[PDB]
Amino acid sequence: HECCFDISLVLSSNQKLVELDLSDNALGDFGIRLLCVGLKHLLCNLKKLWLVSCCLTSACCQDLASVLSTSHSLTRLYVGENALGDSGVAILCEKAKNPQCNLQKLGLVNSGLTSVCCSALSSVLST
Amino acid sequence: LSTRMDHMVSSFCIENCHRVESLSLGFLHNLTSSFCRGLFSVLSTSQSLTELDLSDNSLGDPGMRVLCETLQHPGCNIRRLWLGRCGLSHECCFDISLVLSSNQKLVELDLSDNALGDFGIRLLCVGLKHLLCNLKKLWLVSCCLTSACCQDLASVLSTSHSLTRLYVGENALGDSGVAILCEKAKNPQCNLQKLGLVNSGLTSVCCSALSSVLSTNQNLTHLYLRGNTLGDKGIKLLCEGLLHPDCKLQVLELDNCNLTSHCCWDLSTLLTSSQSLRKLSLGNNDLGDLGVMMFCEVLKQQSCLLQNLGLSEMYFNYETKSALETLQEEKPELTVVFEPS
Amino acid sequence: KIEEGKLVIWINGDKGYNGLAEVGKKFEKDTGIKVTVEHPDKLEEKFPQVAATGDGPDIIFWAHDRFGGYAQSGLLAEITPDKAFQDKLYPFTWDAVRYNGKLIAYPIAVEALSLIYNKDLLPNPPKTWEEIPALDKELKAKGKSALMFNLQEPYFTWPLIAADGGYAFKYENGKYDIKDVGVDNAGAKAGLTFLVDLIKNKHMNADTDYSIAEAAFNKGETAMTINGPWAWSNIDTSKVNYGVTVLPTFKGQPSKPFVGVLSAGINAASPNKELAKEFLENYLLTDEGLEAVNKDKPLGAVALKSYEEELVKDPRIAATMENAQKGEIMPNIPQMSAFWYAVRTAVINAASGRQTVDEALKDAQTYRKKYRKYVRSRFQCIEDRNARLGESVSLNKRYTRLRLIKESPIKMELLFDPDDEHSEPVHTVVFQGAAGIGKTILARKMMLDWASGTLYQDRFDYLFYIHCREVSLVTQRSLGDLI
Ligand SMILES: C[C@H](CCC(=O)NCCC[N+](C)(C)CCCS(=O)(=O)[O-])[C@H]1CC[C@H]2[C@@H]3[C@H](O)C[C@@H]4C[C@H](O)CC[C@]4(C)[C@H]3C[C@H](O)[C@]12C
Ligand SMILES: Nc1ncnc2c1ncn2[C@@H]1O[C@H](COP(=O)(O)OP(=O)(O)O)[C@@H](O)[C@H]1O
Ligand SMILES: CCc1nn(CC(=O)Nc2ccncn2)c(=O)c2cc3sccc3n12
């Protein structure tokens, strides 16, 4: 998570970076909290973000959801192989359902999702 | 506060209070939860509250986040925030930084005795280097810091228009650490007034860096080095700085610093040479039974030292005690010397 | 409060006060501006307070050393003589009043410690310090001493100590180097060592004070002593045919006494800068001005070049100035208060109680180590007494290990540690065994091993041996067995 601060600084000023893959790193929920600072910042043109297998839990979805809500450029979000269980997905969905969200590809691959969270995904798919 | 009943009662009374200047809470075996959230939501609106003391109780990071949100309120008006042994980690530093970046009322922040490791400092410095941060006093005592963090603290000292009090003792900010802080504290435009390098494992090697700061930085009035094994060589080097005509240091505290008899010459020189020094707190060190007699003799010639002369926690003989008592009576302008008894 | 319109002078009443007033009155008649001279007691204590207020005198007459303190406080005005005036006074006295490159006072008179001798016992004083021992032996045969002086006051020992290159504070570019002290180097050590040897050889005692040295000289027990011009007035009552000369040399070098220069400083807050300057420059610092002063009370050697030539008629004055020329200007930095203490505790203790090499060595004897070494030495021998077929040292390496068991074998180390657990340490340990089993030998070995740093290095700072053979049960005493 320590490096997420420095990554955030890059996102805040480097307008050329489009695709960033941070998969398989210990960027725990705190690390996400920091990356989201850069991701929610104007001038960040990041389109693809991979956070697969990053020791994340549902807690981090509170910040990722905000990124999905306000980011004008983020279209690809992969957060599989994490502990983003039903409650985490529901949080993301509450913002991803917004007609103005630019999310195009959602990688909730292996996050312990169950039948309960499917109504949240249904909402997103419908809207 | 012990139970939920106490929270609603305290909340009621504090909310309906228009003249409380300082509040001290002590959460017991309830936090690390939103349990205290109800009260913090009240503190945000108390226009008369200037000091909030949350020290020596377990305030888990999540709790610090809640507090930080409540400190971003337009009507917060809290000027002093004390967060001693709260059990905070580097995680909370992010949230603290956010408060510093927008809360223009906070002046004194005490983060002592928390695990705000070097990384945590890196984050706090984001807020500290930010405009609108009016923080004047910052305590980072015993925060598991190492010399690495000085790279960021030094930048704060360089650019901050407001930080005057910095206490970073009880850490591993050794010779290399302080040297970094000094390089920037050296700048004539640095606003540092009180430097609390109390117990950082400093040695004689780094005293040339402190000397440089003392020589150039005319805003530095208090320097606390007690607990650092500076040695006699250390004092010699510090004195070269202190004897510089532009040095304005008023208070120098030197408790146990592994001192011996030799340094008495340099300390004696300091006592009569500096026109700026007012207080010299030599403490628990083997100053020497004869060494102090030199102080007794020289502190008669219109010395500018008025305050604590130290010599506490030090064994003296009969004649020495008599001489010190005589000095105290003959020169009343010297408030108190402070022998052991 | 500034005393505008008049010039006010403060001077010690033991100086040529009436004379200085005459210079003032002459000045008034010549210029029309009145000069008032006053002599309050402890002017050196009151002046700093009025000077710091703006009140008080325009001109201050006192020793140039104290003036350095005023200069540090900024209580003195800078003086601005041109070279036309600077060249009127001796070329070495301008340093007496120089503070960090600035001139703060006008030199008036120069004191030095000259050699005062009795022509009836010694019409021809020695020119070399090394000759005094021989002179003393010859005089002792006659029943007289060659040299006696105050050795309890470093002021009078310095001339010899500094003779071989020793110095107080280095004086390089007009500023004294505070961190460079010459009392430690070989030049000082050689001088002090020689002096201490003179005491050990019984040419001088260690406890002679001012009164004893003067009494012995005025009585006729000594060929000579060392003093300054300030004491000459008490040397006439003896009716001794005394003379004053230049002190003996040491290894080719002249002695270097502290030179005490009387000077006239000016108050920082006074507007009478041109007035005070002209008063001092063209009236007081003249042959006529100095005669007016000297007429009331002799100044001894004077800063004026021409006036000293006029006074050359008196060899005592000429010798004083010659000594001053060869001497050392007494530093005006407040660090001298530390210096004076440093030498006071150097010479007296060096004379008796320790060596001259020990004296400068940071008080390395911190007692703890002194005792440890005392024990280390004392217990090197198994008995350290008589009865060993010639009293040879047996050498404690002969110690043969004894078996120690608790009432598995144990070591002498860890002896006082807590047992298995309970965090319970032991204060009292008892070693029992038959007479002749080695009880005392073990105790002596233990102390030797401790003193050598091979046992209980961290646990005990002191071991105090109590020999029950020596301690009686009926003799009254405090816990002085420690001594
Ligand atoms: C003023 C000087 C300090 C400066 C100094 O000494 N400067 C040069 C040294 C290094 N050099 C390499 C140039 C030469 C080495 C000498 S060597 O002989 O090794 O060649 C030092 C040197 C010895 C010091 C006294 C003794 O401590 C005993 C005692 C200790 C007490 O607490 C305080 C009182 C007292 C009387 C002390 C006073 C003072 O403090 C002295 C005169
Ligand atoms: N290695 C040794 N260890 C112990 N005692 C020794 C040793 N060699 C010689 N001796 C002798 O044994 C005697 C021991 O005396 P000890 O009984 O300990 O005296 P005390 O009665 O004073 O305690 C002394 O005569 C001593 O010199
Ligand atoms: C040879 C005599 C002797 N014997 N012992 C053994 C002993 O004393 N045993 C017990 C047992 C019970 N009660 C008392 N003593 C010694 O220890 C001893 C020491 C010293 S010196 C000179 C002879 C001597 N000696």
Numbering used by the authors:
A (entry chain D): 784 to 910
B (entry chain A): 657 to 686, 725 to 1035
C (entry chain C): -230 to 176, 201 to 276
Text taken from the publication that reported this structure:
After establishing the specificity of compound C for NLRP3, the cryo-EM structure of MBP-hNLRP3-ΔPYD in complex with ADP and compound C was assessed. It formed a tetramer via the MBP-NACHT and back–back (between LRR and LRR) interactions with D2 symmetry. Two non-protein densities were observed in the NACHT core with the Walker A motif situated in between, and modeled as ADP, and compound C, respectively. This proximity supports the improved nanoDSF stabilization of compound C in the presence of ADP. A comparison of the interactions of compound C and MCC950 with NLRP3 revealed that both compounds bind to the same pocket however interact with the protein differently. The tricyclic moieties of MCC950 and compound C are deeply embedded in a hydrophobic pocket, while the amide moiety linker of each compound is anchored by different amino acid residues. MCC950’s linker is anchored by the Walker A motif and Arg578 with Arg351, while compound C’s linker is anchored by the Walker A motif and Arg578 with Asp662, placed further away from the Walker A motif. The isopropyl furan moiety of MCC950 or pyrimidine moiety of compound C points outward towards the LRR region. Hydrogen–deuterium exchange (HDx) mass spectrometry analysis revealed Walker A&B motifs showed reduced deuterium uptake upon compound C binding, suggesting the binding of compound C could perturb the ATPase hydrolysis activity of the NACHT domain. Indeed, an ATPase hydrolysis assay showed that compound C inhibits the ATPase hydrolysis activity of MBP-hNLRP3-ΔPYD similar to reference compound MCC950. Together, these data indicate that compound C locks NLRP3 in the closed state by interacting with all the NACHT subdomains and inhibiting the ATP hydrolysis necessary for NLRP3 activation.
